[PDB]
Design a binder for this molecule. Structure first.
Ligand SMILES: Nc1ncnc2c1ncn2[C@@H]1O[C@H](COP(=O)(O)OP(=O)(O)O)[C@@H](O)[C@H]1O
Ligand SMILES: Nc1ncnc2c1ncn2[C@@H]1O[C@H](COP(=O)(O)OP(=O)(O)O)[C@@H](O)[C@H]1O
Ligand SMILES: [Zn+2]
Lengths: 92, 242, 602, 97, 399
C-alpha cells in the first residue's frame, strides 16, 4: 500500500549539512564521505516512513536516519576519527 | 452410476427403472465382493446382469432383452455362483425391415405401421421387397417434401440410394414399386392421418391445389419468386467489389 | 447443425467493422498479395458480434476449427477469381492465427480438469530443437495392382494407410517426389523463476506448432500463449501436452542485431527539423543527463561517440576503427557509475557488463560444445553480443590477464580470434567502449604521476582518446548546488517537469533521440575537408615541441591522439548531417581535448 | 543450465537472489567465494539484473533484491587500529553499495 | 540450414556452412556373384535400396543366397564382385554469421563414391543437393514424429576463410604471367615492393622487407637418410607500446597465400589436440586436426609472447627449428608435421626502450629464444617533431 512521499519544505538543509561535513571530513580525516551516503539516507528516510506508515516524510526522523549513517562512519575508521566524535555531534 | 444409468436406459433402444438400477448395483456388488468371480471384462458387465434383474422384480421378457459366446458362460457361471425382386418367396422379420427403414433415420412409428401392414398382409405375396420398398419410399416422399421443395438435388440421391441398397442398375421397376403401393394403400385412416400431418397431397398444399383445380386463375403457380428470396439475394451482390 | 455455424462465422469475415473501416476483409486482400495464406485474429472482436460460436468453440474447439479453415478457403476462392477478373489451381487450407488477453493462468494451478479446452498463460522459453516435418498430401501406388490412390491430412501435424485395396497386407509404397509436407517443431516452456516455491526445481512443458506459426521465437523471450491441453501416449497413463493455437511475443526482448532499419516517413520531418536547428549539440548536452550536474565537457564527448565516425577501408584491408574509445577516471560520487547505468537505456542494441565477465557471462567468446552430439559451437560474447554497439564496463581494474588481452586488442582493431583445438575463428567485434575507474584511495593521484592507480601504465595514455580527471576539490558551494539540483528528484518531480517543459521547448525525450541516433548511425556519409587538414598538424607539432621540454624536465603523446581528433571533429559535424567539415567544430575539438593534455601534465 | 534427476529436464534455477527480486537474500560467510560467485553479487547490487551467455540461451532478469551477508575478520579480532579495507581483505567496488 | 524448412523440400538447395564431424569410409555392395563349380557357370544377383535414387521404386527385400535352383553348392568371388563407397557428414552454419547466443542448426548429409575424400572438420562448405526425406514413420505400421530430414548432394565446394588451414588458391592468366615476367625484370622491385606492402602506414621499411622474405620463406631441404632441414623463417619485434605491430598483424593476415591467427595465451591446443575422440561409430581413439599443425606451408600470427609461460616455450623448440611433434599419451605414440613459420610481438616491462641502457635486460627472455627466431627488430618512439611532421601529412593524405 504505502508509498509515502517527501515534501520539499526544508530539504535544502540536506545541501547544507552535506557540504558541511563533506568539508569537515578533510578537516581531520583521510577518506571522504560521498553522495552515495546521502542517497542512502533518503532511502532510510522513506524506509522509516514506511515503518511508521505515515503519509509522507516527517522532519524529526531524518534525524534518526542521518544519525545512523553518522555513527556508521564513526566506527569505520582509525583512532584519528576520535576528533570527529566531537566535531560531528552537532548534527545529532 | 452414469455408466449404469446409461446401459440401463439402453434397454428401450415406473418401478422398472428404479428397481433395475438398484438390482444392477447390488448385483455388481455381490459379484465383486468375493474373490470368486474374476476375468470378466467390464467391457460387457451390465447385460445378463440386467437380464436376471428383469427376471427378479415381477415381470420378465425373453425378447428384446439379450439383444454371445460368454453370454451363456457368464450366465451359468453367475447362476451357479449365487436382384431382390426376381427372388421368389423370401422371408423377413421385424428387425430386418426396421433396419431397411432406419437406414433413413426415419422414426419408429412409421416403421411399426409398415410392420403391421406386413404381418397382416404378408400372406398372399410374391416378394415383400417390393411392398416394403414402395412403403418406405412413400414414407420418404411424404415426410421429406420440405428439403426437397428447396433442394431438387435430393430426388436423384435418394432413388440412387434405394437403387443400390437392393442392387439394381434398372429402376423403372422401382417406379412401379411406388405407384402400385400407392394404388393399394391409398385410403386407410392412418395413411390419412399421415397426409394431414406432413402435408404432401401429391406433394402440394391444400389451400393451393383446391384453387388450382376447382377452376381458378388466382391459383399461384410460383414462377415468380418470394420477397425474402430477393431480400437475401441482394447481399450476394452487395459485396460484389471483392 | 454445422453449416448454420459456418455462416454465423463467415458473416463475421466481411460483415464486421469497427472505427468505420473494414478490418479483416482488406487484411485478407493484403495477405493474399503477400502470398501468406494466413491472417491474424482477435477473439475479443467476436464476443459482441455473436455468441453462437464462442461458448461452443470453447469446449469443443477441434470440432469447430477446421470448419473455420474451410470457410476461410471458401472466401478465398471467390476473391481469387474476382481479383483475377480485376487484374492479371492450387489453394490449400490457410493456417488460422489468433490471440487474446483475457487472462493468464499458470502451470501450477492446472489440474486434470478443463482438458482439451483452451487456456491462457505465461512462461519462459528454452527449446529450438529441429525442423521436424510432417505430411499433408502424399501419393500411393500399389506394388502389384499398380493401383494409384491418394491421401491428404489436415490438422494433426486418427487413421493410417489402407490395409487392403491378391496383394496381401501392406501393398502400398509412399511416393515422395509428388508428395507434400509441412514443418513443425517441439517447443518447451517453464514458469517465472521469481514466482515459485522456495524449494524445488521447476516444471516445464512441451508444445507443437506449424507452418507460419513456426520460428517466431528464440529463447529467453518471455511470451504468452494460448493452446489446447491435448494428450498423447505407472499403471495406465498418457502424457499431458498442449496444442498451440495462439502465440504472442514481446515485440523485441533482448536486443537483436537483426533490428529495424526502415523507419517510418512521418518521423523524417521532425528529424530534419532537428537536423537544421543550430541548437542541436547544445540540446543533446542539456538532455543526455538531465538529472545530472556539471561535467558538461564529459557529456560533450558521448555525442561524439555514439554517432561513431569514419568507417574507412582501403584496398589492403587495414580498416580504421569507425568508432572511438574512452576512459572515465575518478572517485566515488562524480556520476561515474550513473551514466553507465543509464547508457544502455538510450542505447538501441548495446551491452553492459562488470569486470572479469559477469555471472555466466564471458567477457569474450567463451566457447564450448553441444549437449547433443558433443560438437563445437561459438556460444557467446559480451564483445560480440554487441556487434555494432557500445559496451559499458565498471571495475576495469580487476581484470584477469587472459580476459584483458582480447579486449585490449579490440579497442584498436575490434576483431577477436580464437584458434583452439579444432575450431578456427575470426569473429568481428566492431564495438565502442566505456570504461570506469577505481583510483587507489581516491584523490592524491594528481599529486602523483599520471598512473599510480594500477599496473597498466602503458595502455592508459595509449589506447584512449578521452581520458579525464573527473572531480572538483570540494568547493563548499558546488555541494549545495548539486544537492539542491538533485533533491527535487525524489518528490515534487520538479527536475522531471522541467524536462517536460523543456521537451515542450527545445529538448528531446529518450526514444526520439534513440531513433535519430540509429538513423544517423546507419545513414550518413561523412568526410573532412583538405582545408581542415593543417589546422591540427600545427596543433600537433606545437603540443609536441611544448611538452618535449616539460616532460624532458623529468615528469602519452601518440600518433593515436593525432588520429583521434580526426574522427571526433567529424562526429560533432555529423550531428548536423555533415558530409564535410570546417573549423566551426574543430575549435570545439581542441577546446575539449585540452582537458586531456592538462591531465597529461597532471 | 542444470539437469534434473527426473527425465533430464533442463531447467533454469537462479541464486536465491533471484527468488526475492521483490524481497531479500541472506548470506553468511561472504568471504568464502571464488571469482565468479563474487562477480555475480557485484552485478546484483550494481544494475539489479543478471545476464547469461551460455548454452543456446541469452537473458537478463530482475535482481532488485535486498542483500544481507556476513564474514569473518582476519584474526578473529577487528584490529581496531586500522581502517576497514586495510584490515579485512575485501575489495571496495561492491563494498561501496 | 538455420532456415531450410519443409517449404521447398524437393527443390534443389545450396547451403553454405561448416563441417563438424565425418563418417568412416565403407566400401559397400552393389552385386553378389555366386559361382557354379559343377559346369563352369556363374550366377549374378545385385541389390538396391532407398538412397541410390529419388524415384520411389518398388522395393526388393533381397537376401544372401547359399544354394542354387538346382540345389547345388555356391561359392563367392570377393574380388570379382563390385562394391562402392559411401559417407555421411553433418553440416551447420558458418560461425561468422551466427545468431551468437544460440545453438547451431545442424543436419545430416550423404555422399557417393566420387565425392567423399575432400572434407574434414574445420572446413567451410557449399553444396548443391536435395532436401529429400524418406520413411513411413507412423503412417502404415502403428504408433510422435515424422520423417528423417536430410540431404543428398550432387556438388560440393570448399574455399577460404580467415583462420582455417586452407587457401583460396587464386588463379592466373597468360596476361598475369605476362605482367609478372614484366614485373620481375625491373631492377628496384624489392624496394618498391617493400614500400608497396602496407602503403597504409609509413616507415618500418626494413621490417616489411622482412615480412616479404618470410612469406617467401626458405626451401626446407631434407636429407638422404636423414632428418629435415629448415626453410621457414620467423620474426620478432618489441618496442614502444603504440606502434604498427598489432595493426601490422592484421595486415599480414589477409595478405598471404595462407594465414592463421592467435591471441597469445592459450593452453592445450595451440598446437595440440588432447587426443579424445567421442566415437559411437566404434569404441576407438583417433586425433583431430591440431591448431599450430593446421599450418603446414603458411605463416602464423602470434602476439603478447611475453605473457606466455615456459610450458609452451618449451613446447616450441622442436617446432621452430625441427618442425615436428611426436608424443606419448596413454593411447598413442605417433608423429605429425608442423612445418610452419611465425611472427611475434612484444611489449617490454618499462614501456619503452633506451639505448643508453642495454637492448637485452628489458626484453626479459632466454638468449635461447633470441637465437631461435631468425631475426629480431626493435622499435622506438622517442620524441622529435620533424620525425612526425610528414607522418601527419601522409596519414591525412590517405584517410
Ligand atoms: N555528479 C552527481 N550529481 C548528482 N548525483 C550524483 C552524482 N554522482 C553520483 N550521484 C548520486 O549518488 C549515488 C551514487 O552513485 P555513483 O556515485 O554513480 O556510484 P559510485 O559512487 O560507486 O561511483 C547515485 O544514486 C547517484 O544518483
Ligand atoms: N609508423 C607509422 N606511421 C604512420 N602511422 C602509423 C604508424 N604506426 C601506426 N600508425 C597508425 O596508428 C595506428 C595505431 O595502431 P598500432 O600502434 O599499430 O597498434 P599497436 O600499437 O597495438 O600495434 C594504426 O592504425 C596506424 O594507422
Ligand atoms: Zn493393391
Amino acid at each position: 500500500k504505502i508509498y509515502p512521499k517527501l515534501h520539499q519544505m526544508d530539504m535544502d538543509k540536506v545541501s547544507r549539512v552535506y557540504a558541511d561535513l563533506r568539508r569537515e571530513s578533510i578537516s581531520t580525516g583521510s577518506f571522504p564521505i560521498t553522495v552515495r551516503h546521502l542517497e542512502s539516507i533518503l532511502r532510510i528516510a522513506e524506509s522509516f516512513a514506511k515503518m511508521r506508515l505515515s503519509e509522507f516524510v516527517s522532519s524529526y526522523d531524518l534525524d534518526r536516519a542521518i544519525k545512523v549513517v553518522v555513527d556508521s562512519f564513526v566506527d569505520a575508521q582509525k583512532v584519528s576519527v576520535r576528533r570527529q566524535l566531537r566535531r560531528s555531534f552537532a548534527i545529532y | 452410476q452414469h455408466c449404469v444409468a446409461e446401459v440401463l436406459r439402453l434397454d428401450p433402444q415406473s418401478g422398472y427403472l428404479k428397481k433395475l438400477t438398484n438390482a444392477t448395483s447390488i448385483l455388481y456388488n455381490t459379484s465383486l465382493n468375493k474373490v470368486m468371480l474374476k476375468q470378466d471384462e467390464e467391457v460387457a458387465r451390465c447385460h445378463i446382469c440386467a437380464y436376471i434383474a428383469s427376471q427378479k422384480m415381477n415381470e420378465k421378457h425373453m425378447p428384446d432383452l439379450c439383444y454371445p459366446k460368454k453370454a451363456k458362460h457368464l450366465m451359468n457361471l453367475f447362476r451357479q455362483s449365487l436382384s431382390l425382386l426376381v427372388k421368389k418367396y423370401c422371408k423377413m422379420t421385424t428387425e430386418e425391415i426396421i433396419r431397411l427403414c432406419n437406414d433413413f433415420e426415419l422414426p419408429r412409428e412409421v416403421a411399426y405401421k409398415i410392420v403391421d401392414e406386413y404381418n397382416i398382409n404378408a400372406s398372399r405375396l410374391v416378394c415383400p421387397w417390393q411392398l416394403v420398398c414402395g412403403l418406405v419410399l412413400n414414407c420418404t416422399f411424404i415426410v421429406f417434401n420440405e428439403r426437397r421443395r428447396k433442394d431438387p438435388r435430393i430426388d436423384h440421391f435418394i432413388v440412387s440410394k434405394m437403387c443400390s441398397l437392393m442392387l439394381t442398375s434398372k429402376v423403372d421397376d422401382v417406379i412401379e414399386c411406388v405407384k402400385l403401393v400407392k394404388e393399394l394403400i391409398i385410403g386407410e385412416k392412418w395413411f390419412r392421418d399421415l397426409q394431414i400431418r406432413y402435408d404432401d397431397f401429391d406433394g402440394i398444399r391444400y389451400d393451393e391445389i383446391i384453387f388450382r383445380k376447382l377452376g381458378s386463375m388466382l391459383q399461384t403457380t410460383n414462377i415468380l419468386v418470394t420477397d425474402d428470396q430477393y431480400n437475401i439475394w441482394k447481399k450476394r451482390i452487395e459485396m460484389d467489389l471483392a | 447443425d454445422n453449416t448454420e455455424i459456418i455462416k454465423s462465422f463467415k458473416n463475421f469475415i466481411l460483415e464486421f467493422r469497427l472505427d468505420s473501416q473494414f478490418i479483416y476483409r482488406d487484411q485478407l486482400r493484403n495477405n493474399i498479395l503477400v502470398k501468406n495464406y494466413s491472417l491474424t485474429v482477435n477473439m475479443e472482436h467476436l464476443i459482441g458480434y455473436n455468441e453462437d460460436i464462442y461458448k461452443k468453440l470453447s469446449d469443443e474447439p477441434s470440432d469447430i476449427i477446421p470448419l473455420f479453415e474451410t470457410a476461410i478457403t471458401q472466401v478465398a476462392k471467390r476473391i481469387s477469381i474476382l481479383s483475377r477478373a480485376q487484374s492479371a489451381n492450387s489453394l490449400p487450407t490457410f493456417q488460422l492465427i489468433l490471440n487474446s488477453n483475457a487472462n493468464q493462468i499458470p502451470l501450477r494451478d492446472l489440474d486434470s480438469e478443463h482438458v482439451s479446452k483452451i487456456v491462457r498463460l505465461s512462461g519462459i522459453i528454452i527449446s529450438t530443437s529441429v525442423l521436424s516435418s510432417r505430411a499433408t498430401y502424399l501419393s500411393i501406388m500399389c506394388r502389384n495392382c499398380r493401383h494409384t490412390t491418394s491421401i491428404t491430412i489436415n490438422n494433426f501435424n486418427t487413421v493410417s494407410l489402407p490395409r487392403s485395396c491378391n496383394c496381401g497386407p501392406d501393398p502400398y509404397i509412399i511416393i515422395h517426389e509428388s508428395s507434400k509436407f509441412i514443418d513443425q517443431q517441439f517447443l518447451k516452456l517453464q514458469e517465472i523463476p521469481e514466482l515459485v516455491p522456495v524449494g524445488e526445481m521447476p516444471r516445464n512443458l512441451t508444445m507443437t506448432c506449424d507452418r507460419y506459426l513456426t520460428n517466431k521465437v528464440i529463447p529467453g523471450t518471455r511470451v504468452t500463449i494460448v493452446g489446447i491441453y491435448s494428450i498423447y501416449n505407472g499403471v495406465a497413463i498418457r502424457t499431458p501436452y498442449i496444442k498451440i493455437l495462439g502465440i504472442q511475443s514481446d515485440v523485441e526482448t533482448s536486443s537483436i542485431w537483426n533490428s529495424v532499419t526502415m523507419f517510418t516517413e512521418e518521423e523524417e520531418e521532425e528529424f530534419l527539423q532537428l537536423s537544421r536547428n543550430p541548437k542541436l549539440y547544445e540540446i543533446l548536452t542539456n538532455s543526455i543527463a538531465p538529472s545530472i550536474f556539471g561535467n558538461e565537457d564529459i557529456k560533450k564527448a558521448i555525442v561524439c561517440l555514439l554517432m561513431g565516425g569514419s568507417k574507412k577501408i582501403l584496398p589492403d584491408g587495414m580498416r580504421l576503427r569507425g568508432d572511438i574509445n574512452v576512459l572515465l577516471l575518478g572517485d566515488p560520487g562524480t556520476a561515474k557509475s550513473q551514466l553507465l547505468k543509464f547508457v544502455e537505456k538510450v542505447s538501441p542494441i548495446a551491452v553492459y557488463t562488470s569486470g572479469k565477465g559477469s555471472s555466466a557471462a564471458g567477457l569474450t567468446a567463451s566457447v564450448q560444445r553441444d549437449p547433443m552430439t558433443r560438437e563445437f559451437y561459438l556460444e557467446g560474447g559480451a564483445m560480440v553480443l554487441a556487434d555494432g554497439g557500445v559496451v559499458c564496463i565498471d571495475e576495469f581494474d580487476k581484470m584477469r590477464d587472459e580476459d584483458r588481452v582480447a579486449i585490449h586488442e579490440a579497442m584498436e582493431q575490434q576483431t577477436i580470434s580464437i584458434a583452439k583445438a579444432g575450431i578456427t575463428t575470426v569473429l568481428n567485434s566492431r564495438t565502442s567502449v566505456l570504461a570506469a575507474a577505481n583510483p587507489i584511495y581516491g584523490r592524491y593521484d594528481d599529486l602523483k604521476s599520471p598512473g599510480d592507480n594500477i599496473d597498466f601504465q602503458t595502455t592508459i595514455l595509449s589506447r584512449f582518446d578521452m581520458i579525464f580527471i573527473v572531480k572538483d576539490d570540494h568547493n563548499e558551494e558546488r555541494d549545495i548546488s548539486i544537492a539542491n539540483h538533485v533533491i527535487n528528484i525524489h518528490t515534487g518531480n520538479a527536475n522531471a517537469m522541467q524536462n517536460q517543459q523543456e521537451e515542450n521547448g527545445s529538448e528531446i525525450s529518450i526514444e526520439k533521440m534513440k531513433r535519430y541516433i540509429t538513423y544517423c548511425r546507419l545513414k550518413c556519409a561523412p568526410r573532412l575537408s583538405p582545408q581542415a587538414a593543417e589546422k591540427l598538424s600545427s596543433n600537433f607539432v606545437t603540443i609536441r615541441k611544448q611538452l618535449l621540454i616539460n616532460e624532458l624536465e623529468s615528469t602519452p603523446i601518440t600518433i593515436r591522439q593525432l588520429e583521434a581528433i580526426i574522427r571526433i571533429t567529424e562526429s560533432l559535424a555529423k550531428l548536423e548531417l555533415s558530409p564535410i567539415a570546417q573549423e566551426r567544430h574543430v575549435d570545439e575539438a581542441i577546446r575539449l581535448f585540452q582537458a586531456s593534455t592538462m591531465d597529461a601534465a597532471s | 543450465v542444470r539437469k534434473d534427476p527426473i527425465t533430464k529436464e533442463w531447467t533454469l534455477e537462479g541464486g536465491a537472489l533471484v527468488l526475492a527480486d521483490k524481497g531479500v537474500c541472506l548470506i553468511d560467510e561472504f568471504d568464502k567465494m571464488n571469482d565468479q560467485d563474487r562477480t555475480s553479487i557485484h552485478e546484483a547490487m550494481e544494475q539489479q539484473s543478471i545476464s547469461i551467455s551460455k548454452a543456446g540461451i541469452v537473458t537478463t532478469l530482475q535482481a532488485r533484491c535486498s542483500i544481507i551477508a556476513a564474514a569473518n575478520p582476519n584474526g578473529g579480532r577487528y584490529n581496531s587500529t586500522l581502517p576497514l579495507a586495510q584490515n579485512v581483505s575485501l575489495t571496495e567496488p561492491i563494498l561501496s553499495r | 540450414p538455420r532456415t531450410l524448412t519443409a517449404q521447398h523440400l524437393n527443390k534443389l538447395v545450396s547451403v553454405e556452412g561448416i563441417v563438424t564431424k565425418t563418417s568412416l569410409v565403407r566400401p559397400k555392395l552393389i552385386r553378389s556373384v555366386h559361382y557354379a563349380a559343377k559346369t563352369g557357370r556363374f550366377h549374378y544377383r545385385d541389390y538396391t535400396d532407398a538412397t541410390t535414387t529419388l524415384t520411389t521404386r518398388i522395393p526388393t527385400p533381397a537376401i544372401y543366397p547359399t544354394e542354387d535352383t538346382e540345389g547345388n553348392k555356391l561359392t563367392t568371388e570377393y574380388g570379382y564382385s563390385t562394391f562402392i563407397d559411401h559417407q555421411r557428414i553433418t553440416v551447420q552454419e558458418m560461425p561468422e554469421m551466427a545468431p551468437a547466443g544460440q545453438l547451431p542448426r545442424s543436419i545430416d548429409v550423404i555422399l557417393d563414391d566420387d565425392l567423399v575424400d575432400k572434407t574434414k572438420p574445420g572446413d567451410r562448405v557449399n553444396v548443391v543437393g536435395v532436401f529429400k526425406s524418406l520413411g513411413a514413420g507412423g503412417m502404415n505400421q502403428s504408433n510422435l514424429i515424422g520423417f528423417k530430414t536430410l540431404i543428398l548432394g550432387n556438388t560440393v565446394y570448399p574455399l577460404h576463410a580467415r583462420s582455417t588451414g586452407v587457401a583460396a588458391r587464386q588463379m592466373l592468366t597468360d596476361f598475369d604471367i605476362r605482367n609478372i615476367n614484366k614485373l620481375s625484370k625491373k631492377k628496384d622491385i624489392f624496394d618498391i615492393l617493400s614500400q608497396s606492402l602496407a602503403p597504409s602506414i609509413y616507415g618500418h621499411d626494413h621490417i616489411k622487407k622482412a615480412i616479404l622474405l618470410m612469406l617467401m620463406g626458405g626451401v626446407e631441404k631434407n636429407l638422404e637418410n636423414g632428418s629435415h632441414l629448415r626453410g621457414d623463417i620467423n620474426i620478432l619485434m618489441v618496442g614502444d607500446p603504440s606502434t604498427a605491430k598489432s595493426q601490422l598483424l592484421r595486415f599480414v593476415l589477409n595478405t598471404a597465400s595462407l594465414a592463421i591467427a592467435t591471441t597469445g595465451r592459450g593452453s592445450s591446443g595451440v598446437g595440440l589436440t588432447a587426443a579424445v575422440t567421442t566415437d559411437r561409430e566404434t569404441g576407438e581413439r583417433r586425433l583431430e586436426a591440431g591448431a599450430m599443425v593446421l599450418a603446414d606451408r603458411g605463416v602464423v600470427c602470434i602476439d603478447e609472447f611475453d605473457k606466455m609461460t615456459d610450458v609452451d616455450r618449451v613446447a616450441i623448440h622442436e617446432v621452430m627449428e625441427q618442425q615436428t611433434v611426436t608424443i606419448a599419451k596413454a593411447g598413442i605414440h605417433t608423429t605429425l608435421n608442423a612445418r610452419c613459420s611465425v611472427i611475434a610481438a612484444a611489449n617490454p616491462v618499462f614501456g619503452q626502450y633506451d639505448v643508453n641502457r642495454d637492448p637485452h635486460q628489458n626484453i626479459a627472455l632466454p638468449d635461447s629464444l633470441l637465437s631461435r627466431f631468425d631475426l629480431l627488430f626493435v622499435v622506438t618512439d622517442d620524441i622529435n617533431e620533424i620525425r612526425d611532421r610528414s607522418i601527419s601529412e601522409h596519414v591525412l593524405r590517405t584517410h
